[PDB]
Amino acid sequence: IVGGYTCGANTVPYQVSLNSGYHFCGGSLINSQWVVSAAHCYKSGIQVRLGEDNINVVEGNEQFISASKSIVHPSYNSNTLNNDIMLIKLKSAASLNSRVASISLPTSCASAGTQCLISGWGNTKSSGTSYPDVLKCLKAPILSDSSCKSAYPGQITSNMFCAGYLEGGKDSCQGDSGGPVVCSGKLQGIVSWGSGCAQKNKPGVYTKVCNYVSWIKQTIASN
């Protein structure tokens, strides 16, 4: 996250870190056994780390649980990042508490103008590289479809929305991918892509979760 703030330990209790020897992607806990992330985050050997603040120090609220199954969306296209969403089932159920908690799925889509909370352990510089150990947060509005399409001609599908600031300086970044965009207590986006980070006229592009709730629910009901 560029231009954000230190969330505070365990204040984003649905935030997960995906670990394959090192943090490489965010996710969101959506019930005791399932994590939503970005399909472009797919790899084998995933350990899900819940209850994290400092990803480099064992602080006492962590739960580390191996992935038993990953399911990338049936229609994911890695070239266009259309349908940039995947589900991860945990080998055992997380113990849900005040610091490890699921995030509600939306019943309706967010609209342009709604402020949202975006979080992750991604890069904090737009012209440089510095990775935080503790979780970083950013409050950002959804942008209109037209201004999203105008920022990225020929690239925005109906499964994508933009959020952030056209003026630059505040965005998600590399290593935030897969993580949450939460608006009024509902998971409305997944950190997906963008041209650099926090660049003028190049806001963050997010997977539009409301389009996938049917798929998420049916997948969870059969796996």
Ligand SMILES: [Ca+2]
């Ligand atoms: Ca830790």
